[PDB]
Structure 1
Amino acid sequence: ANGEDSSFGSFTFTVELFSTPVWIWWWPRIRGP
């Protein structure tokens, strides 16, 4: 009656992918010094 919308403004979701190098501590595991 009112009209079913199909424009679908947000149907272009696209989406990418990213990451971040994290900080670590290997001092106690060191076999040496």
Structure 2
Amino acid sequence: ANGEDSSFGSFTFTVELFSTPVWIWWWPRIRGP
């Protein structure tokens, strides 16, 4: 009696992946200057 939606207008989930380079501070790391 209820029926079936059979639509799922959000079924296909598009997936990605991306990142960003990160600044690090190295000045006391140094074995030199």
Q: TM-score range by the shorter chain?
A: 0.7 to 0.9
Q: Which runs of 4+ in 1 moved over 6 A?
A: none
Q: Name the TM-score, length of structure 2 as normaliser.
A: 0.80
Q: Where does the alignment leave 5 or more consecutive residues of structure 1 unmatched?
A: none
Per the TM alignment, residue 2 of structure 1 is displaced from its structure 2 partner at its CA by 3.1
Distance (Å, rounded) in 2 between the aligned partners of 1:11 and 1:24? 41
Per the TM alignment, residue 25 of structure 1 is displaced from its structure 2 partner at its CA by 0.1
Per the TM alignment, residue 18 of structure 1 is displaced from its structure 2 partner at its CA by 0.3
Q: Name the TM-score, length of structure 1 as normaliser.
A: 0.80
Identity %: 100
Per the TM alignment, residue 4 of structure 1 is displaced from its structure 2 partner at its CA by 1.8
Q: How many residues align?
A: 33
